[PDB]
Curated annotation (Swiss-Prot), chain A:
Family of the protein in this entry: Belongs to the WD repeat LIS1/nudF family.
UniProt keyword Lipid metabolism, yes or no: no
Protein name from the UniProt record: Nuclear distribution protein PAC1
Organism expressing this protein natively: Saccharomyces cerevisiae (strain ATCC 204508 / S288c)
Highest classification ranks of the organism: Eukaryota, Fungi, Dikarya, Ascomycota, Saccharomycotina
MF terms (GO), sorted A to Z: dynein complex binding; identical protein binding; microtubule plus-end binding
Cell compartments where the protein resides: Cytoplasm, Cytoskeleton; Cytoplasm, Cytoskeleton, Spindle pole; Nucleus
UniProtKB/Swiss-Prot annotation, chain B:
Residue ranges of the region described as AAA 5: 727-948
Sequence similarity: Belongs to the dynein heavy chain family.
Superkingdom: Eukaryota
Lineage: Eukaryota, Fungi, Dikarya, Ascomycota, Saccharomycotina
Subcellular location: Cytoplasm, Cytoskeleton
Name by which UniProt lists this protein: Dynein heavy chain, cytoplasmic
Domain notes: Dynein heavy chains probably consist of an N-terminal stem (which binds cargo and interacts with other dynein components), and the head or motor domain. The motor contains six tandemly-linked AAA domains in the head, which form a ring. A stalk-like structure (formed by two of the coiled coil domains) protrudes between AAA 4 and AAA 5 and terminates in a microtubule-binding site. A seventh domain may also contribute to this ring; it is not clear whether the N-terminus or the C-terminus forms this extra domain.
Additional detail: Present with 195 molecules/cell in log phase SD medium.
Gene name linked to the record: DYN1
Curated annotation (Swiss-Prot), chain C:
MF terms in GO: dynein complex binding; identical protein binding; microtubule plus-end binding
Quaternary structure annotation from Swiss-Prot or TrEMBL: Self-associates. Interacts with NDL1. May form a complex with dynein.
Full-sequence range covered: 139 to 494 of 494
Comment block on domains: Dimerization mediated by the LisH domain may be required to activate dynein.
Main subcellular location of this protein, as a coarse class: cytoplasm
Family: Belongs to the WD repeat LIS1/nudF family.
Keyword Membrane among UniProt keywords: no
Job of this protein: Positively regulates the activity of the minus-end directed microtubule motor protein dynein. Plays a central role in positioning the mitotic spindle at the bud neck during cell division. Targets cytoplasmic dynein to microtubule plus ends, thereby promoting dynein-mediated microtubule sliding along the bud cortex and consequently the movement of the mitotic spindle to the bud neck. Following plus end binding, dynein may be offloaded to the cortex by NUM1. Required for viability in the absence of the kinesin-related microtubule-dependent motor protein CIN8.
Swiss-Prot/TrEMBL keywords: Cell cycle, Cell division, Coiled coil, Cytoplasm, Cytoskeleton, Microtubule, Mitosis, Nucleus, Repeat, Transport, WD repeat
Residue stretches of each WD repeat: 15-54, 58-104, 111-152, 155-194, 207-248, 263-302, 305-340
GO CC annotation terms, alphabetical: cytoplasm; cytoplasmic microtubule; kinetochore; microtubule associated complex; nuclear envelope; nucleus; spindle pole
Gene (name only): PAC1
Protein name: Nuclear distribution protein PAC1
Compartments, record wording: Cytoplasm, Cytoskeleton; Cytoplasm, Cytoskeleton, Spindle pole; Nucleus
Length: 346, 975, 342
């Protein structure tokens, strides 16, 4: 259920109006959400892919990234947020009765184009992260509609973020990584060793099923809850980083304020655009019209999807396996500049 | 070990020269090594002094303008001032050798003498010199003066005084024999081919082929053709180094791959500097015959050899289509990220990108791009630097700038390269070198791995402090001065790449830039030149294949093959591209360019103007035809309804007979106007982008040339075509005439040219300075008048850009290069905000900001940047202007009331004509937008009233005709 | 999949300025192209039908017919090719730039001596050709790349009202009640067929699917690949013919009527076959669906438009690169269009 490898050929070929920028998977129902460089936001069924279910033009500029969340409460719907080049973050609602996108509100506050967003629920409260070209990374409130904290962690503009509870690591254009504790709003460590701007950076969440890079090494790291990070840059390389433990709001250790490259994956022929982790594998896509599959234990590309698109490959994702609220289904969707979307099934 | 420049093959001549040089140097005598460039004076010197643990080498490269202070500055970090005055070297065990290279290069004064040569004569004869500040005598103790110079028969070399050469022994070094060169590069090729042991038997034929190619290209391409055709064994060393790099960073090789790799290296080393296409064909045949003779394979043209590592992990030959697609996507990302510019990617652009990338990937790889303006040199350089992870640095050298600004910019660049290890590509245009001191600074920067006089005294000590701090930051174990400065120069050599952009190589300053010794021997010369006609065909087709052009019948003309530059003609688009290319060639030929490079900016601007104008004209024609057809159909339907079946409707139907016949005439003429649309758009674009700086006679001659070219390719055009009747409407003309324009057709054409340049700023050349007040009257109180000669012009311009007012900058011949971002329209977009970088801080463009440049001095100095990137328009007083102004003055002074009545009558008549045209347009719109009967009756009554008013007002024109016929004689005598 | 039954109620209501004449569907996108009697070409997004994606005054008179084709080049970027036939004695070839959602006029085909009534687009391995017919009694076939005509012949004494292309064979329906199968590269007729008493409206081929009419009878018919066809006229009758095998440049001999359909109350306008089902509208403001096997109507669609119903489009199901979407679009005289999805 975990060591599944996609087949040589995609299960379906979804045609979109223009360059696909981001694709996301619904954690509950078999339906995929496809962004669009024209600014549209599509939603295609996993079995009837000829026609979309709902689509609308909300942004006047190119959508940069998006993600979804299946909310759960101890006291139940899908929330879609969508960044774009319009300096705006539009929040949508997915009603399952008539399968139509319901616009909730538009979130403002950025002085330049917004790149990445992150949404998560913490004790019946949901927060929306954001990072933009104005060098400001922000985490906002969905229910209140207002901002919560704003800070500038990087000297150049930030391109991608990822959250693990209250901790956020934000790669930027200055070829560096930085881990900042959001509630205190201060930097903790730096990641140096890349020579080209970071495309997408994300955490390595722990699993219990052995995988070398998804397990704690010491009891202190297990208590902290994070140890490693993975970052993809324009150096045609995927680097695994190690987070030094701070003084525990956490206080950065002055002699332990720098990262350490645990492993550096190489073999891509162009800029590594997007990365994802499933089990012991690291699914990644790049601009060489190819999709790799790096085994995390050995650091070797076991399967290469050569010429998957006739153009650049932009985004892909899997199901999150570290969360018990989402079943890790064996479905993979991959979009690209070819104005096509490829879904891999079974 | 091929990359290491300290590797010398011991031959008979090498060991003989090294031993005699060492024996002369141990005799405490001056040495002047003579010989042609590339003989190996520096080589045998480094080989001789490398194995000795008691001599040190100090390298100074003399330029055209070199002073004693440069020699003193280059020695102050190696020597000490001890009063035992005495200029002892810093080391107590090792002596110092002052290598003074290119001694023949420092120029003579007005009275025929050299300061540096006399200083060196004082150094070796009197063993000291006089120190200028405190007027004291120093004594040179342990410094040996050794020189190296070319024979004086070479151009740029001056004879030397015998009083200086008397104290120095002279050793001549000629070129090695062809057998010796073959043996040398056979040893190098064995060292290279150790990487590929399965082709170990081909080392000697490759070396023989390379040396034969070098000898043949030296015999063919001599100095008598171009001044930069100086070939040397350094060219073969560069070829060997490129072969080693392309082998080491490549895949497993075969025979065809090896031969094509070597041929690509030969193309990039030898034939990159060739100017004429005939020399390129000669080199192509030379490579063919050399490979056939010595290496017993595909096409070996320049475009067919595309070796690059941009697509994979290895340096290998790649296809053109996938490379073009990759470069297109990467340039889309570049335009989104760094700088937005709409330029078209073609094959020559791809090849130039590949060779710039190959040059920049090297260590100490500097490049010197030579070509016409608006060819794509600085954008290509910035794009390649962005692809390689470099940081672009363009010095903001402007007017009212001195040595201190350039020195600070260079010091900041060096500090970033060394302390901050930021890999930097420095773009230096020929316009950033205001004085020869800048060129000397850059020559010293390129020859050595730093500039010595920029770090002297407390600046030198604080540089030592900064470098020591950074060295302890990396944890490197070094304490002495020499190791730290070696680290400094190594970091600068590794992390700095210099790019020279030259637009007019015939210019004296650019000629000195090219003929500089260190710039020539270090930079990789790329003579891009102008655009060959295949490149112009490619870019023209690629930017006109997105417009409606084929909407009429087209009979393919039967013309000569040599007169067709595109693919064989099948459509109107190819005919249009060939017409535009032919007119560009004829225009550049008839403007007497000579051998100067020809800027393709006029071609690109004409193409863009043609694109937008034909799009607008086709949309207008389609809309007008749709309106007239639906109007005729509605009239016919109403007539049929009236016949099948009320007095007002009958009167309205009967009152639209003239409108009906005019509409029928327009529908009949629709086919003829559609056939001739493309030719009219072409001629309009040529008027907009080509004829700005021409008088009436030259415009007429070029129009005749364009018309015969346009009829040659079976493209139709209006026989009675006129620029005023096509691009100038009645609203625009009346606004201009109320603003204060003259009644001249030439001035109206020029006003239409300057008011339709939405892309490039217009340059006004009006000696009378009347258009200043004209454009101030056009925009009312929002107009602001700036000048390039006034202090505080920068802040006023920035404030006007922030507010969004219309700016007219006077004195265009004193161009200030801080606004090069505004002239080239290299804006940056932040969502809905457009920002431009002026000076040092970016400012926001309001979107209503407009820029006019004015200059009242004809035959002024306009830089090729501004000249190529503006729509320069002349404003001269022709015969018609003289006659009109003389008639107006004599009528005002003879009968003022008559003149006032006449001008009021003309204004009233043309205003009524405009009102009648607007009434007709409103009638058509209201007819197609279907109370109404009364509205149309009122419109008809108003039109009849205007017609009657014009009929009454045309009863005074023969009197005006008699007056102008009476005063034509005084008009013609005045002119 | 191929057995989809359309729902009773229309789902999308598209409003335009004039009477809809020709409607074509995007083979890969949920985009509908609408042509009017005003010549304005309309591109309407299906999920935003209130405003068009892009509009263009393509022709100065009424557009008579339309066809689209998505190129599949073996080497070159693929793009959608849109052609329009109107009463301006001209044919315009467009290109849908889905990157920006705009209409890009590539070239125009000129030479027809009266109003063009029909078009048809098909692709060879690397060649795209455009066919046409008009009131001047000729069937002119052009080339998409070069733009000049490649064949011109007069198949009928009366004026051809509709044509269809299947490779090297052209069938033409005219104001005269007869049809004729004409070989393309040689320009010679092969067979004719009569039986109608009214001018023929729309004629199109029938393609084999791996069924009563989509299954070949013998191997000699398998080698040719054509056995039947469909045509209809103002006779309120749709007839299936049998194509005789000519003496194979083929050398020519009558059409055998194997099926007739009755039930339409007025003149039919369009014909479309979806697997086992046949779709056709008429001027009775109704859309009738016919089974291929039984040859009798299954479902009726009454009172969709106040005026006449003009055209239908259903996606081609015999093409590898064209996905058979469960969709169809129809146009009407009342400035209204209907879209049925899923
Ligand atoms: N063993 C050798 N004998 C002769 N020439 C050699 C030998 N080894 C290298 N060379 C050539 O000598 C060149 C060095 O010349 P250089 O000293 O720069 O000339 P210059 O004295 O004009 O500065 C190298 O480019 C190399 O090709
Ligand atoms: N391949 C191309 N296609 C279209 N336009 C080009 C191309 N190359 C250059 N240009 C024009 O040249 C301008 C930039 O070149 P530029 O920097 O002026 O050359 P230079 O470095 O000689 O001054 C642009 O404004 C662009 O319009």
């Amino acid at each position: 259920v975990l060591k599944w490898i996609p087949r040589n050929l995609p299960s379906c070929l979804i045609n979109v109006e223009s360059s696909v920028t981001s694709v996301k998977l619904h954690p509950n129902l078999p339906i995929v959400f496809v962004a669009t460089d024209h600014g549209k936001l599509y939603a295609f069924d996993l079995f009837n892919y000829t026609i979309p279910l709902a689509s609308l033009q909300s942004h006047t500029k190119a959508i940069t990234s998006m993600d979804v969340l299946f909310t759960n409460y101890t006291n139940n719907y899908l929330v879609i947020v969508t960044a774009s080049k319009d300096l705006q973050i539009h929040v949508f609602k997915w009603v399952s009765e008539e399968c139509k996108f319901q616009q909730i509100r538009s979130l403002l506050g950025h002085e330049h184009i917004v790149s990445a967003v992150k949404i998560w629920q913490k004790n019946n409260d949901v927060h929306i992260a954001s990072c933009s070209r104005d060098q400001t990374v922000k985490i906002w409130d969905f229910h209140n509609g207002w901002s919560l904290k704003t800070f500038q962690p990087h000297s150049q503009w930030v391109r991608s973020i990822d959250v693990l509870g209250d901790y956020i690591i934000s790669g930027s254009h200055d070829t560096t990584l930085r881990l900042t504790h959001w509630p205190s709003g201060n930097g903790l460590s730096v990641g140096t060793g890349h020579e080209f701007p970071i495309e997408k950076v994300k955490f390595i969440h722990f699993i219990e099923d052995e995988i070398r890079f998804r397990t704690p090494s010491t009891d202190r790291y297990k208590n902290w809850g994070m140890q490693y990070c993975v970052s993809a840059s324009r150096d045609r390389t995927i680097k695994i980083w190690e987070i030094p433990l701070p003084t525990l709001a956490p206080i950065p250790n002055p002699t332990d304020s720098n990262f350490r490259c645990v492993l550096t994956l190489k073999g891509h022929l162009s800029w590594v655009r997007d990365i994802s982790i499933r089990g012991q594998y690291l699914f990644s896509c790049a601009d060489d019209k190819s999709v790799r599959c790096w085994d995390l234990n050995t650091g070797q590309c076991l399967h290469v999807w050569e010429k998957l698109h006739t153009g650049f490959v932009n985004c892909l994702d899997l199901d999150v396996d570290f969360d018990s609220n989402v079943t890790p289904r064996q479905m993979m969707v991959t979009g690209g500049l070819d104005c096509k979307s490829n879904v891999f099934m079974r | 070990e091929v990359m290491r420049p300290d590797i010398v093959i011991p031959t008979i001549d090498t060991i003989k020269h090294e031993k005699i040089f060492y024996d002369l140097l141990n005799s405490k005598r001056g040495i002047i090594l003579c010989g042609p460039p590339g003989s190996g004076k520096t080589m045998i010197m480094n080989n001789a002094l490398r194995n000795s643990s008691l001599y040190d080498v100090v390298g100074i490269n003399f330029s055209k303008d070199t002073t004693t202070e440069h020699i003193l500055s280059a020695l102050h970090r190696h020597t000490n001032y001890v009063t035992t005055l005495t200029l002892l070297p810093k080391s107590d065990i090792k002596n110092l050798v002052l290598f003074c290279d290119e001694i023949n290069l420092p120029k003579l004064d007005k009275y025929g003498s050299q300061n540096v040569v006399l200083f060196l004569r004082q150094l070796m004869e009197k063993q000291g010199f006089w120190k200028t500040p405190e007027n004291k005598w120093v004594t040179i103790e342990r410094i040996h003066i050794v020189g190296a110079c070319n024979p004086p028969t070479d151009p740029g070399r001056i004879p030397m005084s015998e009083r200086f050469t008397r104290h120095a022994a002279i050793l001549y070094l000629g070129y090695p024999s062809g057998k010796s060169l073959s043996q040398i590069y056979e040893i190098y090729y064995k060292a290279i081919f150790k990487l590929v042991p399965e082709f170990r038997s081909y080392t000697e034929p490759f070396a023989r082929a390379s040396v034969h190619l070098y000898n043949e290209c030296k015999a063919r391409y001599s100095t008598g053709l171009q001044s930069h055709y100086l070939f040397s064994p350094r060219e073969l060393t560069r070829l060997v180094r490129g072969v080693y790099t392309a082998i080491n960073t490549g895949p497993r090789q075969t025979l065809r791959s090896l031969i094509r790799l070597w041929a690509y290296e030969a193309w990039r080393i030898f034939a990159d500097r060739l100017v004429g296409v005939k020399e390129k064909n000669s080199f192509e045949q030379l490579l063919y015959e050399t490979v056939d003779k010595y290496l017993p394979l595909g096409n070996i043209s320049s475009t067919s050899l595309l070796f690059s590592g941009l697509l994979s992990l290895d340096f290998k030959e790649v296809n053109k289509t996938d490379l073009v697609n990759f470069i297109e996507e990467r340039f889309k990302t570049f335009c989104d990220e760094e700088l937005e510019v709409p330029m078209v990617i073609h094959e020559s652009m791809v090849d130039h990108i590949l060779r710039i990338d190959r040059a920049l990937k090297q260590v100490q790889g500097h490049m010197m791009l030579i070509g016409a303006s608006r060819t794509g040199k600085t954008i290509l350089t910035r794009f390649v630097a962005w692809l390689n992870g470099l940081k672009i640095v363009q010095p903001k050298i402007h007017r009212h700038s001195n040595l201190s600004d350039f020195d600070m910019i260079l010091k900041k660049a060096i500090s970033d390269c060394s302390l901050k290890e930021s890999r930097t590509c420095l773009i230096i245009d020929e316009s950033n070198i205001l004085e020869t001191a800048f060129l000397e600074r850059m020559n010293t920067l390129l020859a050595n791995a730093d500039i010595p006089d920029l770090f002297q005294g407390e600046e030198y000590d604080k540089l030592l402090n900064n470098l020591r701090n950074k060295t302890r930051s990396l944890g490197l174990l070094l304490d002495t001065e020499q190791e730290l400065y070696d680290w400094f120069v190594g970091e600068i050599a590794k992390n700095l790449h210099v790019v020279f952009t030259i637009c007019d190589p015939t210019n004296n300053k650019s000629s000195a830039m090219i003929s500089s010794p260190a710039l020539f021997n270090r930079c990789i010369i790329n003579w891009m030149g102008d655009w060959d006609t295949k490149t112009m065909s490619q870019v023209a087709n690629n930017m006109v294949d997105v417009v409606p052009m084929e909407f009429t019948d087209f009979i393919v003309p039967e013309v000569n093959k040599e007169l067709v530059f595109t693919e064989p003609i099948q459509t109107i688009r190819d005919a249009v591209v060939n017409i535009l290319i032919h007119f560009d060639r004829n225009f550049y030929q008839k403007m007497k360019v000579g051998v100067n490079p020809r800027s393709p900016g006029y071609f690109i601007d004409g193409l863009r103007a043609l694109v937008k104008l034909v799009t607008a004209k086709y949309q207008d024609l389609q809309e007008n035809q749709r309106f007239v057809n639906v109007g005729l159909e509605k009239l016919n339907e109403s007539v049929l309804k009236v016949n099948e079946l009320l007095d007002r409707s009958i009167s309205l139907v009967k009152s639209l007979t003239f409108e009906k016949e005019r509409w029928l005439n327009t529908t009949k003429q629709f086919s003829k106007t559609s056939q001739e649309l493309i030719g009219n758009c072409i001629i309009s674009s040529i008027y907009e982008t080509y004829f700005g700086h021409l008088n009436e006679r030259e415009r007429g001659d070029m129009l005749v040339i364009l018309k015969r070219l346009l009829g040659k390719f079976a493209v139709k055009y209006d026989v009675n075509y006129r620029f005023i009747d096509y691009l100038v409407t009645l609203d625009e003309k009346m606004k201009w005439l109320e603003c204060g324009l003259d009644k001249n057709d030439y001035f109206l054409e020029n006003m239409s040219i300057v008011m339709n340049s939405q892309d490039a700023v217009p340059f006004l050349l009006d000696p009378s300075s009347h258009m200043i007040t004209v454009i101030s009257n056009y925009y009312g109180n929002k107009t602001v008048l700036l000048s390039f000669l006034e202090e505080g012009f920068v802040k006023r311009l920035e404030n006007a850009v922030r507010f969004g007012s219309v700016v007219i900058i006077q004195d265009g011949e004193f161009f200030d290069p801080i606004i090069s971002r505004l002239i080239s329209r290299e804006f940056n977009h932040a969502g809905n905000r457009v920002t431009v970088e002026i000076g040092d801080h970016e400012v926001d463009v309001s979107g209503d900001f407009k820029l006019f440049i004015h200059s009242c001095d004809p035959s002024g100095d306009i830089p090729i940047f501004l000249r190529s990137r503006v729509r320069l328009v002349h404003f001269v007083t022709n015969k018609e202007s003289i006659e009109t102004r003389i008639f107006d003055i004599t009528l005002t002074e003879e009968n003022a009331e008559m003149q006032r009545k006449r001008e009021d009558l003309i204004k009233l008549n043309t205003e009524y004509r405009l009102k009648l045209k607007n009434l007709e347009k409103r009638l058509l719109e209201e007819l197609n937008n279907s109370e109404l009967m009364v509205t149309l009756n009122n419109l008809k009554k108003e039109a009849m009233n205007i017609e009657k008013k014009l009929s009454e007002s045309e009863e005074f024109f023969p009197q005006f005709d008699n007056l102008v016929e009476e005063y034509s004689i005084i008009g013609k005598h005045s002119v």
